[PDB]
Amino acid sequence: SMFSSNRQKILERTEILNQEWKQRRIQPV
Amino acid sequence: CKYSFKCVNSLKEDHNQPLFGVQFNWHSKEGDPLVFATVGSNRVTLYECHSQGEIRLLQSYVDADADENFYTCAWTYDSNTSHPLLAVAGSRGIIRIINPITMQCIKHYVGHGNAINELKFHPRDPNLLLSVSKDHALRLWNIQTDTLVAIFGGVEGHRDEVLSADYDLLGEKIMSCGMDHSLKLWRINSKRMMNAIKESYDYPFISQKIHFPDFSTRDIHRNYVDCVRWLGDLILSKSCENAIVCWKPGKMEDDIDKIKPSESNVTILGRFDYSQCDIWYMRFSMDFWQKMLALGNQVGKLYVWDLEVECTTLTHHKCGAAIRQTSFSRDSSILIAVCDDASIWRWDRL
Numbered sequence: 017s018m019f020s021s022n023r024q025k026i027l028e029r030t031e032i033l034n035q036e037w038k039q040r041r042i043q044p045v
Numbered sequence: 046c047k048y049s050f051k052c053v054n055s056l057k058e059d060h061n062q063p064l065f066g067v068q069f070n071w072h073s074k075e076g077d078p079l080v081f082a083t084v085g086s087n088r089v090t091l092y093e094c095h096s097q098g099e100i101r102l103l104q105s106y107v108d109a110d111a112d113e114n115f116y117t118c119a120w121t122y123d124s125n126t127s128h129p130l131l132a133v134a135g136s137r138g139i140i141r142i143i144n145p146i147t148m149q150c151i152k153h154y155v156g157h158g159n160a161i162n163e164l165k166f167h168p169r170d171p172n173l174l175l176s177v178s179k180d181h182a183l184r185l186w187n188i189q190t191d192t193l194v195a196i197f198g199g200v201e202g203h204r205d206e207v208l209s210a211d212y213d214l215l216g217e218k219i220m221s222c223g224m225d226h227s228l229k230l231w232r233i234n235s236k237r238m239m240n241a242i243k244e245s246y247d248y249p250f251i252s253q254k255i256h257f258p259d260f261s262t263r264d265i266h267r268n269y270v271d272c273v274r275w276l277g278d279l280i281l282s283k284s285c286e287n288a289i290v291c292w293k294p295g296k297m298e299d300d301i302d303k304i305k306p307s308e309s310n311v312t313i314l315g316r317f318d319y320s321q322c323d324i325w326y327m328r329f330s331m332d333f334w335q336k337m338l339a340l341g342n343q344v345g346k347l348y349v350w351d352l353e354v355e356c357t358t359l360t361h362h363k364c365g366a367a368i369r370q371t372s373f374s375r376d377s378s379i380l381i382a383v384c385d386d387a388s389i390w391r392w393d394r395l
């Protein structure tokens with residue numbers, strides 16, 4: 017499906033960004 | 046729609062001017078308070094969200110130019126110090142880099158021959174800032190070396206004001222749109238662009254002049270396109286027809302990375318319909334996980350759709366002014382809307 021395959025791409029790519037974010041410790045404002 | 050929200054608070058900024066932008070800082074780590082910035086008139090204001098719907102004012106930046114009108118802001122971080130940074134721009138066509146801890150401008154960039162409508166930071170490299178302008182061009186800046194990496198425009202660039210642009214999730218390509226009714230793709234993972242980005246780190250610096258996009262279409266909307274965002278390999282964009290159109294370059298089966306610059310087809314997959322949002326300059330937003338889509342209208346209604354469905358309407362009787370932009374917190378627990386009457390509305394997810 018067009019929807020199921022695109023959702024899977026979003027899931028994999030957002031997980032890559034979330035893992036990059038989890039490794040960072042940006043100071044609070 | 047399975048998503049429900051409760052309006053827990055609202056306030057009005059004392060300048061009484063329209064608020065055109067709102068952005069939560071998605072770079073803040075877990076455990077730290079949720080913070081958002083609002084932009085409008087010659088002001089940038091930061092707020093912290095707390096329990097029981099509290100919207101805590103932190104501080105404001107007032108530009109020395111009383112006639113500056115900020116239209117957009119974007120968050121990033123300093124890769125060397127891990128401190129947060131906020132970029133702002135508007136009618137003057139000047140990009141200001143603000144230190145949010147002090148709310149002071151630390152540096153600025155000139156170059157655009159007119160107003161800047163949108164700023165966006167690259168999702169992987171925090172130093173790469175994209176600006177889009179009424180001068181018909183997009184510009185990519187490296188804020189670590191204070192260099193202009195590239196100018197996207199010229200022979201086959203936009204022929205009228207650029208209103209919006211977005212990077213894809215991994216930061217390999219940009220889609221831009223504007224007053225010429227077109228949506229254009231610019232690949233930044235090309236060997237030319239990857240080398241230009243590397244040269245900007247080695248660094249007057251000579252910017253790449255990218256005259257030709259990797260795809261262009263005028264067949265999705267028949268009028269100005271004021272907002273575009275990627276939804277994976279698909280695109281969401283809107284004009285004044287009370288609909289956000291979900292589409293993709295090429296035929297149904299065509300892979301986004303195999304599309305040739307001369308590709309003449311587009312595939313329209315569907316539309317998210319709404320009402321009373323046919324004036325220019327109204328932005329839609331998505332949460333981090335791209336599970337929810339939000340858009341405010343001219344009479345203060347906030348539409349939310351569940352993107353995991355191949356519509357919840359948030360209304361408050363005292364919220365009646367145009368909602369220019371909305372922002373979700375990184376964890377999707379809070380949704381903030383900002384309006385033409387300088388009001389800010391906080392909606393908490395149930």
Ligand SMILES: Cc1ncccc1-c1cnc(NCc2c(F)ccc3c2CCO3)n2cnnc12
Pocket residue numbers: 065066114116117160161162163207208209271272325326327328369370
């Ligand atoms: C001065 C002014 N008065 C009255 C109404 C609007 C404007 C205005 C606002 N915003 C922008 N640009 C930013 C921008 C955009 F480009 C596309 C969509 C979008 C926005 C903000 C919210 O949704 N303007 C550019 N020129 N006038 C403007």
Ligand SMILES: [Cl-]
Pocket residue numbers: 068069070071118119120
């Ligand atoms: Cl942002």
Ligand SMILES: [Cl-]
Pocket residue numbers: 254255256257
């Ligand atoms: Cl070129």
Ligand SMILES: [Cl-]
Pocket residue numbers: 265266267283284285286288290
């Ligand atoms: Cl349309």
